[PDB]
Amino acid sequence: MWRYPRNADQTFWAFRTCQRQSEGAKSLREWYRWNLPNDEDTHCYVKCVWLHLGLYNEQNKSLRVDRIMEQFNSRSVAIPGGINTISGPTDGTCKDIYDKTINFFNNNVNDLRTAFYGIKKLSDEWFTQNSNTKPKGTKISDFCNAENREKGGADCQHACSAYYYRLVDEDNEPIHFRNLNILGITDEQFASCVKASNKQGCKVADTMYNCVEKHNSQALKILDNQSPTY
Numbered sequence: 001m002w003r004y005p006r007n008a009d010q011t012f013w014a015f016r017t018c019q020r021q022s023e024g025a026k027s028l029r030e031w032y033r034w035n036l037p038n039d040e041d042t043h044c045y046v047k048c049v050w051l052h053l054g055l056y057n058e059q060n061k062s063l064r065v066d067r068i069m070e071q072f073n074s075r076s077v078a079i080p081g082g083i084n085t086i087s088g089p090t091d092g093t094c095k096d097i098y099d100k101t102i103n104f105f106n107n108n109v110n111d112l113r114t115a116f117y118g119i120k121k122l123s124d125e126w127f128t129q130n131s132n133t134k135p136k137g138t139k140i141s142d143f144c145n146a147e148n149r150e151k152g153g154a155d156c157q158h159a160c161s162a163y164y165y166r167l168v169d170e171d172n173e174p175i176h177f178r179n180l181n182i183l184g185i186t187d188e189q190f191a192s193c194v195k196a197s198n199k200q201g202c203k204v205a206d207t208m209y210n211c212v213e214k215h216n217s218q219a220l221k222i223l224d225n226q227s228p229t230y
């Protein structure tokens with residue numbers, strides 16, 4: 001189950017993972033400077049980030065306005081105006097989710113960057129003060145191989161890596177929406193790993209890790225290779 005508020009590693013992962021999933025986009029460079037142009041790839045990049053932050057409810061096709069507000073409150077940032085526009089059901093398209101949130105973004109850019117650690121100084125401070133989280137610049141394998149993290153406090157073998165690959169969340173619950181298609185894992189294959197993982201504790205993480213590796217032996221190696229900055 002997802003935890004809120006989202007921390008600086010969790011927000012960083014959502015941005016970078018969604019950037020990788022749209023890496024051929026014409027507007028990629030604009031996203032780097034916090035500009036979200038009105039084009040299809042940007043629409044779907046925006047939907048991806050809302051989803052990967054844990055802020056899109058796929059069941060009612062609505063933003064988790066309650067958790068968005070919690071992020072502001074937890075970060076001591078004033079609640080922005082215009083919340084009504086981002087609230088309520090969408091039709092599920094990238095276009096609709098973009099249209100419902102673009103003014104909210106454009107009208108509150110720097111407060112949103114503050115609340116979601118989108119400022120280098122604020123992110124650097126979070127990581128400095130949370131040394132038990134994988135630092136930027138360090139690979140998942142190198143971090144999780146240290147301090148017996150892969151054991152998960154028990155007898156596991158991939159407890160830490162499965163978390164940082166986002167196969168499972170902090171609760172060792174599988175992350176159902178994870179997209180590893182470009183790594184050679186189809187949606188059906190990933191779903192089968194989720195289903196294979198009534199297991200309990202970090203055994204869910206190990207089951208997800210082993211199942212993914214079984215489908216494609218390189219996929220998790222690629223995520224590890226990408227992991228210094230995701």
Ligand SMILES: COCCOCCOCCOc1ccc(C(C)(C)CC(C)(C)C)cc1
Nearest residue numbers: 015031032034046049050101105112113116
């Ligand atoms: C290599 O370094 C790349 C760093 O880029 C990280 C910043 O990502 C770019 C910003 O992109 C977005 C994506 C989504 C959003 C939304 C609209 C979803 C708002 C948000 C993040 C405040 C919830 C805003 C900016």
